[PDB]
UniProtKB/Swiss-Prot annotation, chains A, B, C, D, E, F:
Reported impact of R22Q: In MODY10; reduces binding affinity to INSR; reduces biological activity; reduces folding properties
Top-level taxon: Eukaryota
Impact when changing H10D: In HPRI; Providence
UniProt protein name: Insulin B chain
Species of the source: Homo sapiens
Amino acid sequence: FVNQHLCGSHLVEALYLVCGERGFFYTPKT
Amino acid sequence: FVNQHLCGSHLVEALYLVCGERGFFYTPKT
Amino acid sequence: FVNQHLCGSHLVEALYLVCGERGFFYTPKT
Amino acid sequence: FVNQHLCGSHLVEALYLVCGERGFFYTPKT
Amino acid sequence: FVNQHLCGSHLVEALYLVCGERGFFYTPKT
Amino acid sequence: FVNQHLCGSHLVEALYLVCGERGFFYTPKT
Amino acid sequence: GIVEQCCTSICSLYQLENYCN
Amino acid sequence: GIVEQCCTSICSLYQLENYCN
Amino acid sequence: GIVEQCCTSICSLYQLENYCN
Amino acid sequence: GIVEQCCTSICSLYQLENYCN
Amino acid sequence: GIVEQCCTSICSLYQLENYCN
Amino acid sequence: GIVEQCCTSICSLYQLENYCN
Ligand SMILES: [Cl-]
Ligand SMILES: [Cl-]
Ligand code: NA
Ligand SMILES: [Zn+2]
Ligand SMILES: [Zn+2]
């Protein structure tokens, strides 16, 4: 697979695609 | 603000907008 | 709720989410 | 250009692309 | 990675994420 | 119609809208 | 209107242009 | 849960806020 | 306007409500 | 093909990779 | 190419039609 | 974190898997 910059909502749409059923967390504060 | 019909990626995009840099969990059933 | 930068199509998707049934106008010329 | 099936946010994203910085109104029924 | 239900623009967005700067073809039937 | 900058996934969503049934290719390497 | 026609039926980009400012 | 309620039914932005960190 | 307010600078969802019909 | 399989059925990201250049 | 044309510079929807099959 | 890793710098889909539940 390939890399690149994912920012704002593009990052959570990528998480959605990757994780889907499993769910994910999005924590920009960490 | 109005009521929403939100499926798939659109739900996560809405969470991103509502929660922002506070972050969020996405936890579907199964 | 939280703030941040919304540009291009992200701004009108945010308007859609916020306004929904009511509709909105998007006028970058003002 | 081809015919489109456009629901929800996708309709507003298409308006954004078609109208651009001329801007647009989004006026659903009810 | 999980299985996906991907329609419309969402299929092309997933191709973009999976293929990246390698690029891709989008070839629907008819 | 109008112009403007289309980058990342926004470019392939624009291709999808424009081309639809016909399909398209996205080749950033050219 | 257009919102319903695009979603329930189909519409063209040329039709969408009518909602430009 | 929310994922199902927003999609199968409807939900408010105020409901979505409950999933903020 | 909305671009200058929500894009170049930041804006709240409540300000975006200013642009609802 | 893939466009139909992803939408009517389901598909994997590994399947989508086959349409990469 | 398309990136240099529609992203780094701007492009019209008619130019994007150049990349339809 | 994820922002610093996948946004400011670049990241792979495998790294994004780190943030699945
Ligand atoms: Cl962007
Ligand atoms: Cl959809
Ligand atoms: Na999108
Ligand atoms: Zn974007
Ligand atoms: Zn959608």
